[PDB]
Amino acid sequence: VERIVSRDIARGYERIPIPCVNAVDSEPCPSNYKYVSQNCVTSPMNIDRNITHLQYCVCIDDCSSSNCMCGQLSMRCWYDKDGRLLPEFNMAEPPLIFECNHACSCWRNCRNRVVQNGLRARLQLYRTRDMGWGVRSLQDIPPGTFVCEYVGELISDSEADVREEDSYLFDLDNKDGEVYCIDARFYGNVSRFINHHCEPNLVPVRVFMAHQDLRFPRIAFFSTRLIEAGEQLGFDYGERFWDIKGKLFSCRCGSPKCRHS
């Protein structure tokens, strides 16, 4: 029988509820972490938030023209009228996306704003049979759709070096020697429950919104293909995760092309 153990793990902080169900075992809704809908810090990170350091656009339309300066930073704006990534988007090597911000001349409803509008897809935390908790989609998700952000505690590489629990770490970009991490172990959103898959239906894209401090991209998962209702979400944790954890367990994604089994 399928137990509903929470109607919303996000406690109303997202646009839609994220329920938790368990049809497998006795386990209650996870509670050894704090759900947060946006990134937080403990020790200060000193993100550059000087408003005069933002690059911005001067568009007189909805930022759908060839001349949007913010699209230009992104190579071009990659969003169509439905907020979905263009078919030409390179899922194997995604560019950095610069969404419009509060310094731009455009309106808050312009085309070049997707991740900043928050989670929209109907997701569900559920108990898998042999990979603990996982996240599934409750709807069909068309290709190129923003699904969720990898949200957690922003930490330095030196702090990650002394964090014993590293199963919920996302490495950010090396910028002029400085590297940072998102640790979702103690504070995180729904993304902390997404399991690894070697042929993933999500790809992480680095996105800039309210600030443009290149040390601190935000990590937005977009669908790489049509995700069918009921499907488990997955992304590729990458080679550092498996170089460390492969000596403890092998991958159970079940792909016929699994690279970590």
Ligand X SMILES: COc1cc2nc(N(C)C3CCCC3)nc(NC3CCN(C)CC3)c2cc1OC
* Among ligand X, Zn ion, a copy of itself, none, partner that 150 touches (CB below 5 to 8 angstroms by kind): none
* Among ligand X, Zn ion, ligand SAM, none, partner that 132 touches (CB below 5 to 8 angstroms by kind): ligand SAM
Query: Is 258 part of any known ligand binding site?
Result: yes
For 91-126, give one letter per residue: b (16+ CB within 10 A) or e: eeebeebbbbbeebebeeebbbbbbbeebbbebbbb
Q: Which of 73, 119, 190, 253 binds ligand SAM (CB under 6 A)?
A: 253
Question: Which residue type is seen at 190?
Answer: V
Count of residues engaged in binding ligand X, rule: CB under 6 A: 17
Site track for ligand X across 239-258, x = CB under 6 A: -xx--xx-------------
How far is residue 19's CA from residue 12's CA, in Å, rounded to a whole number?
11
Question: Which residue type is seen at 240?
Answer: R
Q: What are residue 207's DSSP bridge partners?
A: 97, 218
Q: Which of 39, 195, 201, 224 binds ligand SAM (CB under 6 A)?
A: 195
Structural element, H or E, at residue 21: strand 20-22
Residue 69 touches a copy of itself, criterion: CB under 8 A: no
Q: Which of 5, 21, 131, 210 binds ligand SAM (CB under 6 A)?
A: 131
Residue 174 touches a copy of itself, criterion: CB under 8 A: no
* Among Zn ion, a copy of itself, ligand X, none, partner that 166 touches (CB below 5 to 8 angstroms by kind): ligand X
For 140-149, give one letter per residue: b (16+ CB within 10 A) or e: ebebbbbbbb
Residue 13 touches a copy of itself, criterion: CB under 8 A: yes
Nearest of 92, 67, 55 to residue 209 by alpha carbon:
55
3-state SS track over 67-81? CCHHHHHCCCCCECC
Interaction with a copy of itself in 139-168: which residues (CB under 8 A)?
A: 153
Query: Is 209 part of any known ligand binding site?
Result: no
DSSP class of residue 105 equals S
Interaction with ligand X in 170-199: which residues (CB under 6 A)?
A: 170-171, 179, 181
- Classify 53 as helix, strand or coil: helix
Q: What are residue 150's DSSP bridge partners?
A: 219
How far is residue 93's CA from residue 39's CA, in Å, rounded to a whole number?
24
- Using the minimum distance from each CB to a copy of itself, give the nearer residue, 44 or 87: 44
Q: Which of 75, 108, 229, 254 binds a copy of itself (CB under 8 A)?
A: 108
What phi and psi, each to the nearest 5 degrees, are found at residue 80? -85, -170
Neighbours of 201 (CB within 10 A): 22
Structure tokens at 101: 């911000």
Query: Is 195 part of any known ligand binding site?
Result: yes
By CB under 5 A, name the binding residues for Zn ion: 57, 59, 63, 68, 70, 100, 104, 106, 110, 112, 198, 251, 253, 255, 258, 260
Binding site for a copy of itself (CB under 8 A): 11-13, 34, 36-38, 40-44, 46, 48-52, 102-103, 106-109, 153, 187
Binding-site residues from annotation for Zn(2+): 57, 59, 63, 68, 70, 100, 104, 106, 110, 198, 251, 253, 258
Using CB under 6 A, list all residues that contact ligand X: 157, 160-161, 163, 166-167, 169-171, 179, 181, 237-238, 240-241, 244-245
